Amino acid sequence: SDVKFVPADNYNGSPIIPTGNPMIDGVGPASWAEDRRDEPDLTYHGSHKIVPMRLDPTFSIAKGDPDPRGLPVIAADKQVAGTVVELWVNRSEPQVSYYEVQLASGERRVLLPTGYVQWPNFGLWGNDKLLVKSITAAQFANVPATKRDDQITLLEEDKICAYYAGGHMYAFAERSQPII
Amino acid sequence: MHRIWLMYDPRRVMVALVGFLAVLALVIHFVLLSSQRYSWIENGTLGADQAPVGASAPAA
Amino acid sequence: MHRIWLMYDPRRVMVALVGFLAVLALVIHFVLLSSQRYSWIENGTLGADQAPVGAS
Amino acid sequence: MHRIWLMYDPRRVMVALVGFLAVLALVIHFVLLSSQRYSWIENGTLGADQAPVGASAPAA
Amino acid sequence: MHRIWLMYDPRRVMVALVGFLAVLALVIHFVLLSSQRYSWIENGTLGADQAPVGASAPAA
Amino acid sequence: MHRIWLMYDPRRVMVALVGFLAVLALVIHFVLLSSQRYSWIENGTLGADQAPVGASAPAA
Amino acid sequence: MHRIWLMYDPRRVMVALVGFLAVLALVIHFVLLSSQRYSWIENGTLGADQAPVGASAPAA
Amino acid sequence: MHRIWLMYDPRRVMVALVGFLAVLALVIHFVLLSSQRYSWIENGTLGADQAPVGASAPAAAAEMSPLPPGR
Amino acid sequence: LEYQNLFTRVQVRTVPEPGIPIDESTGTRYGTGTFSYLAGKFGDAQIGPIYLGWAGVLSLIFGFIAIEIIGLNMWASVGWDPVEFIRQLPW
Amino acid sequence: TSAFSIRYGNLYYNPFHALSIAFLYGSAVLFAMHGATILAVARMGGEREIEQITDRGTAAERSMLFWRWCMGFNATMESIHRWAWWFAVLTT
Amino acid sequence: MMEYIDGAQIALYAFWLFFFGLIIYLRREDKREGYPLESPQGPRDGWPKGAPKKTYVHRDHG
Amino acid sequence: GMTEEEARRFHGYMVTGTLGYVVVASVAHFLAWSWRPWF
Amino acid sequence: GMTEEEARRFHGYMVTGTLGYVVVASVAHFLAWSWRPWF
Amino acid sequence: GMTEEEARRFHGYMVTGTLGYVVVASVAHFLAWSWRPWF
Amino acid sequence: GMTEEEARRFHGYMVTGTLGYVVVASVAHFLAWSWRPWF
Amino acid sequence: AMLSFEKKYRVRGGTLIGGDLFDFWFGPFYVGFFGVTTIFFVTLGTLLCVWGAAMGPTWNLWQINIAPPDLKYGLGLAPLREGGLWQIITLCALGAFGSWALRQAEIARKLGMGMHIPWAYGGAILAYTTLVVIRPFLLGAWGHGFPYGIFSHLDWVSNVGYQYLHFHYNPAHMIAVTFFFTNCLALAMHGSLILSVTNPPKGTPTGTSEQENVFFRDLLGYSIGAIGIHRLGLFLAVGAAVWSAICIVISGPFWTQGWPEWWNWWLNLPIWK
Amino acid sequence: SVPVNDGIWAWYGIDDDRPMAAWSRFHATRCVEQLAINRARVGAAEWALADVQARGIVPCIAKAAAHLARARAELADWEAQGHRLEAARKVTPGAWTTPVI
Ligand SMILES: CCCCCCCCCCCCCC(=O)OC[C@H](COP(=O)(O)OCC(O)COP(=O)(O)OC[C@@H](COC(=O)CCCCCCCCCCCCC)OC(=O)CCCCCCCCCCCCC)OC(=O)CCCCCCCCCCCCC
Ligand SMILES: CCCCCCCCCCCCCC(=O)OC[C@H](COP(=O)(O)OCC(O)COP(=O)(O)OC[C@@H](COC(=O)CCCCCCCCCCCCC)OC(=O)CCCCCCCCCCCCC)OC(=O)CCCCCCCCCCCCC
Ligand SMILES: CC[C@H]1c2cc3[nH]c4c(c3C)C(=O)[C@H](C(=O)OC)c4c3nc(cc4[nH]c(cc(n2)[C@@H]1C)c(C(C)=O)c4C)[C@@H](C)[C@@H]3CCC(=O)OC/C=C(\C)CCC[C@H](C)CCC[C@H](C)CCCC(C)C
Ligand SMILES: CC[C@H]1c2cc3[nH]c4c(c3C)C(=O)[C@H](C(=O)OC)c4c3nc(cc4[nH]c(cc(n2)[C@@H]1C)c(C(C)=O)c4C)[C@@H](C)[C@@H]3CCC(=O)OC/C=C(\C)CCC[C@H](C)CCC[C@H](C)CCCC(C)C
Ligand SMILES: COC(C)(C)C/C=C/C(C)=C/C=C/C(C=O)=C/C=C/C(C)=C/C=C/C=C(C)/C=C/C=C(\C)CC/C=C(C)/C=C/C=C(\C)C(=O)O
């Protein structure tokens, strides 16, 4: 028994049903491109494209924007998941690709993609906590780990991003059901 | 003939059937209501001797 | 006969049914409301022999 | 002849066939209903001697 | 000539042939139905001497 | 001559050829059908000397 | 001369040549078909003495 | 109902209040300035009996029509 | 309420701005990179150096004279009145 | 522009004008669809399109499946840009 | 001297033949990923058959 | 998934509700017919 | 997919149903012709 | 793909179906011709 | 891809089929010319 | 049939209405409750269009013309052969387009995507709803809608424009046109750039985001960047439809004179009156 | 420009980060929030320096040290606000029972 899903019935257009925890097995909106190349993305000059900002001294926060480091992360159940302790930057097109969150409920640091963070009041004011609608504060403990802490492979990028994407369906049982 | 329900999922053949009949019924009613002979909402109380009949031009 | 509710969860049918009947009732009323014979908001007081007939 | 159903899934052929026959029948009915001779909702009660016929060639 | 079915999958060729023939038949029928001489739904009951003919070259 | 079928795949050339002949035939038929002289569906029964002919050089 | 087939892939050249010839032939045919002198579908039977000719007079 | 001051930051309630009053004031002024009767910049010195009043009923001549004949 | 990716709250800046990589002859890069905070909030931030070469330089000279002829004829058509040149410009 | 259509008897009936409009509208349809599609998967790196073309991730898979499940056929992360290119080019 | 056939019509069918050629080409390009399709009756190609999957040469080092 | 006795319980309500609605609609048509017949 | 025995069984229903449909349609044309012949 | 014996077998049906189709079309054309000739 | 002997076997079908088609088309022009010559 | 990677994505859930009841596929298509309502309205609307063609003067595709009612019918349903059919088809159209957008939302929720596509399509639905619902309602008769016919609706567009003598002078229309033209330019540049780095000349290595960024920056002087160009394309394409809705809703309900004389306010600014 | 934390509301004069020596509940709330954030931000900055010293990458060590110093300076700025508000809280009658810092 290692197949991640089964057909809901035998008819031709029927959905599949996951056999385990779909966020972890990677089924439905939690699935990732499992064949994706397990190497880092590279710049035009061949250096690692995505690296913690701590390891490239040319990068800095833009003067008008909030510094996310030290801010608390608020998860989907409104509990504090942790605090941001590092930024990861894309060096080909200068931007923040990930926050790295020190978990409050353990010893791990996990990556948090920027596309899953909302700022209070759409960032028009406040700018003093991060909102993560996708997953609960408990589910942060299972965010996929990178093999190293100074680089990330294209496969690890897919696994981490897919994990948060799955939470919009799987974080609470009610999220899968219709509104009416 | 009951093997139809083995080939196809009855839950959704039956949705397709009810959908098809509903569309067909509405089309036929709107067609008849467009006609002159069967505009029943306005001319429904006319007897058949009074009811419209379409013809071509007399072509003298 | 009751087994259609083992195929179709009734709570998810009944919301669909209400929508269909609400739209159907609105459509029929508006079709009548702007006919000549049944425009009751303006000619409802006429009585059956005075009501329009679509002869031509 | 039956090996045609080894080549094609009958479950798919019946869908294709029902779709084709449904559209074809609606086409033929609407074509006739748009004609002058077979506009049977307005003129169906006319006898065949009374039904419209399209223009002849004039003789000279 | 049967090795044409080793060049091409017969399951695909037959779907393409059925598609081609259906489109072609509908095209030809709609060409004829648009004509005067072969507007058969209106004038099908006319004799061959009565059916429309397109005009000739005028005599000198 | 046959080495052309090593430079090109006969599966592609034969479908390209069928498509070309299909288009070309339809182009020639529709060009003719749109003409006066060869609008055969309306005027095909005319004899060769009765069929339309384009106007001559002007004479004065 | 054959070094041309070493500079350019004959497979690529043959498509370009046939494309050029097909377009050029179609252009020339429809240019003639659009003329008065050479509109051969309507007037091909006229014979050279009574085929149209473009206007002469520079003056008088 | 002074518990309303517990529900909101009072600085922001004053900003919203001032906005609402300012906008409503300008709405009513420009409505009046567009009217005939209260076009005060042009007609403010007219006496109350001289100021315009909207007609109770316009007249007509039976051949005249304000709109062109339609289809 | 879910993050819509329409606006970036946190930009990062590099002290150096990227240059052009290769083939600098018959033409050269003018200027040097700078950052716009507004452009960096719509999209990417670097307002760059720019390339012309021979064709680009000549294109601007010809195109400037074209636009100059258009504008001077427009301005002559209102009798050189600079108020009417602006007031009537789109006509 | 208006007088040209008046002189030549209403340019709406020019079939190449009608084609040009269809491609002008289709360019707006495509950039709306493609712009929205890439923003809907940008949470997964879909905007890194060259990387998604050379190393298909779940962002490319999900955008292909969205359109397949919606309208029954799809492009790829590369070939959508060919559709874009031709619709723009054919307008003019 | 052809009355019905005119240059605008000739041009328009020229375009249609190019355009239907172009749609075919684009639908071949659209199938370089995800094809052949899985089916309970085995692989399926759709129509036209897709162009083969590309392999991309990476920048040698940088 | 719903059990067969739950389905049977609902079916009794669903039949009764439908038929009650149809009965009320029939009375509405009787009033409409009396006021202005359509045949 | 299907066994050849299953193909034979389906073919029996398919041919029979096809011909039955054509028989009903042939009667429909008999009636239509009797009412208003098209040639 | 097919084995050549399957290709040989399929062709025999395909030819016969093509013949049967051409025959029905030949009757259809001769009915049409005797109703209303086009030359 | 084809071996040269496969290309040679294909070539003879392709030539024969082309010439067969041209022969049928030659009769079609013989008929069309007899009905309405274009020169 | 399924794409080679598709099967693991075909889970239940993400519906707005109906739950598991319609949560299945038909070939490539996702169905769902709004799929069922889509097919209903599409079918009913399309067959009523065919009925409109049948009772009209021709089957010629270009010439079929299902016209709205006379203005005298106001906001009532007209007789079906006198424009009431156009009204029923319009309700089917509104139902079909709304069902399509909600079905797109269900698909996006099933894939864990953002809601960008349904809302982008809402821009087009807004323009259609302006043309046939909002503007005719503000004018007080459904007969102000455009007719359903491939060329007859272009006759409507022509005549509505000349109701304002010189519709080019409509200021919202100038903005809408500028968005449409700017969108098409931006689409040609985005397509070209991605293709030119992914399909370089033979024997060249595959390009990079840096090369794309450098080239674009020589075109416009600034880098738009990867997410920026997709934001721009969405802003331009949807803004074009929104400004189109504005330009037609102000024509008639709010401005009734010729559009050239709207520009009188610019000529009378006090600095140069 | 707008300040980061009051943002759009700084156009209307709400500006709770400004140096305040009187007691004010709004500034006290802000200072408690910003102290916790800046203490965590210092804690992060010195973890970052320790990591880069372990890797030994000198130019990164230099920047991480500069960042830590800057983070300490910002924390001191908020602790100054906390104390001056603490002094006022003790004497202004309506003020909080809990300390500000
Ligand atoms: C105006 C200028 C700008 C105008 C701009 C217009 C742009 C239009 C672009 C899109 C058109 C193509 C759409 C498409 O590819 O759908 C997939 C489908 C199937 O192939 P597949 O997806 O690769 O494979 C899946 C299939 O093999 C097996 O799937 P499954 O088993 O799960 O499902 C059952 C099958 C049954 O097949 C069908 O039902 C196909 C019916 C297609 C009819 C519509 C053709 C429209 C052509 C328009 C171009 C032009 C035709 C002349 O598969 C399906 O169920 C697939 C359903 C796909 C539904 C697509 C509906 C698209 C309707 C578009 C209407 C556009 C009207 C303008 O493809 C096809 O069937 C063949 C399409 C071939 C491309 C068109 C080329 C036409 C060139 C000229 C004729 C060539 C003759 C040889
Ligand atoms: C913009 C213009 C238009 C829009 C234009 C643009 C859109 C164009 C769309 C193009 C067609 C798309 C077709 C498609 O997607 O098919 C997917 C399927 C995939 O293969 P599969 O996965 O193996 O197929 C499923 C099958 O194996 C199992 O089906 P399932 O169990 O899931 O569902 C059952 C079926 C319905 O069952 C039946 O049809 C069998 C009924 C028994 C027939 C017995 C004979 C009766 C004789 C009576 C004689 C008479 C007695 C007198 O389907 C469903 O359940 C569908 C979902 C539920 C229904 C949806 C809601 C409908 C509600 C509204 C009502 C609509 C009414 C039309 O493929 C196939 O099955 C093979 C290809 C089928 C082609 C179908 C289209 C043929 C059109 C021919 C056009 C001809 C032009 C002249
Ligand atoms: C596919 C169809 C669409 C399209 C495509 C398109 N247009 C394009 C491109 C593409 C793909 C380009 O690459 C090109 C471009 O550069 O884009 C940024 C361009 C372009 N599209 C343009 C415009 C444009 N495109 C339009 C439309 C469209 N373009 C279509 C919708 C329209 C419309 C709708 O009307 C317009 C107005 C231009 C912005 C640009 C071409 C620029 C160009 O050719 O400029 C020539 C130079 C000048 C006119 C001179 C300017 C002079 C300045 C006043 C400076 C003077 C400096 C100095 C005084 C002189 C020099 C001194 C020396 C000593 C240095
Ligand atoms: C908002 C910016 C632009 C935009 C965007 C846009 N369009 C979109 C989307 C987006 C983002 C989609 O997601 C959606 C889609 O799925 O595309 C594949 C769509 C789409 N844009 C479409 C077309 C379209 N968009 C247009 C315009 C635009 N689309 C805007 C310019 C136009 C124009 C200007 O003419 C057209 C024709 C469709 C391909 C598709 C929406 C498909 C849909 O709704 O499907 C369900 C309905 C049907 C299949 C048929 C309904 C039939 C009716 C019931 C009967 C007919 C009534 C109709 C009013 C008759 C009209 C006759 C005409 C001759 C006047
Ligand atoms: C212009 O002219 C045109 C329009 C063109 C002319 C044509 C028109 C056409 C074609 C019309 C077609 C109409 C049609 C066709 O079928 C119409 C069909 C109508 C139908 C079917 C109506 C059905 C109504 C059903 C109702 C109301 C049910 C109510 C049920 C209730 C209240 C109880 C629910 C259960 C509960 C609460 C359980 C409690 C206990 C629990 C839970 C427990 O105990 O656990």
Ligand SMILES: COC(C)(C)C/C=C/C(C)=C/C=C/C(C=O)=C/C=C/C(C)=C/C=C/C=C(C)/C=C/C=C(\C)CC/C=C(C)/C=C/C=C(\C)C(=O)O
């Ligand atoms: C205006 O004029 C224009 C239109 C222009 C003129 C032109 C017109 C043209 C070109 C028309 C062409 C028409 C045409 C051409 O061929 C039409 C062809 C029609 C055909 C072929 C119809 C076929 C119908 C077949 C039917 C109904 C089959 C029913 C099957 C049944 C009931 C059994 C199902 C199985 C069962 C119950 C058991 C399962 C067992 C299982 C699974 C098991 O046992 O395992």
Ligand SMILES: COC(C)(C)C/C=C/C(C)=C/C=C/C(C=O)=C/C=C/C(C)=C/C=C/C=C(C)/C=C/C=C(\C)CC/C=C(C)/C=C/C=C(\C)C(=O)O
């Ligand atoms: C403007 O011009 C205008 C006016 C338009 C005028 C001009 C028109 C023009 C240019 C027309 C051109 C027409 C044309 C040109 O070629 C037309 C060519 C037509 C052709 C080729 C028709 C061929 C038909 C063939 C058929 C029907 C075959 C059916 C076969 C059947 C049923 C058997 C299937 C197999 C079975 C059952 C066995 C399974 C066994 C298995 C699986 C096993 O054993 O495994």
Ligand SMILES: COC(C)(C)C/C=C/C(C)=C/C=C/C(C=O)=C/C=C/C(C)=C/C=C/C=C(C)/C=C/C=C(\C)CC/C=C(C)/C=C/C=C(\C)C(=O)O
């Ligand atoms: C309006 O008037 C305007 C338009 C203006 C006037 C102008 C018009 C113009 C310019 C016209 C130009 C025309 C033209 C120019 O080139 C026309 C050229 C036409 C040509 C080339 C036709 C060629 C036809 C060839 C055919 C049909 C081949 C058939 C082959 C068959 C059947 C065999 C298949 C293989 C088998 C069976 C083997 C299987 C076994 C295998 C594999 C095994 O055993 O291995």
Ligand SMILES: CCCCCCCCCCCCO[C@@H]1O[C@H](CO)[C@@H](O[C@H]2O[C@H](CO)[C@@H](O)[C@H](O)[C@H]2O)[C@H](O)[C@H]1O
């Ligand atoms: C005792 C007086 C003390 C000083 C008062 C200072 C008054 C300053 C101007 C007040 C009016 C400004 O105008 C008012 O601004 C507020 C600011 O939120 C707007 O408020 C609204 O829009 C803003 C953005 O603009 C949103 O962030 C806010 O959530 C929403 O409520 C009102 O819609 C507007 O009417």
Ligand SMILES: CCCCCCCCCCCCO[C@@H]1O[C@H](CO)[C@@H](O[C@H]2O[C@H](CO)[C@@H](O)[C@H](O)[C@H]2O)[C@H](O)[C@H]1O
């Ligand atoms: C009106 C119709 C006029 C005739 C139409 C054209 C088709 C004629 C087919 C019957 C005549 C024989 O036609 C001939 O068939 C043989 C096989 O049988 C083909 O022969 C082909 O296969 C054989 C092996 O089987 C190879 O050795 C040969 O090199 C290859 O060409 C010839 O290429 C073709 O010329």
Ligand SMILES: CCCCCCCCCCCCO[C@@H]1O[C@H](CO)[C@@H](O[C@H]2O[C@H](CO)[C@@H](O)[C@H](O)[C@H]2O)[C@H](O)[C@H]1O
């Ligand atoms: C002679 C030279 C002529 C050059 C002409 C240049 C004209 C340029 C005018 C730019 C006007 C921009 O105006 C801006 O348009 C956008 C269009 O999306 C509007 O935005 C509107 O559409 C967007 C979608 O795109 C919605 O999300 C938004 O809620 C809505 O307001 C803005 O509210 C308006 O402020």
Ligand SMILES: [Fe+3]
């Ligand atoms: Fe893109």
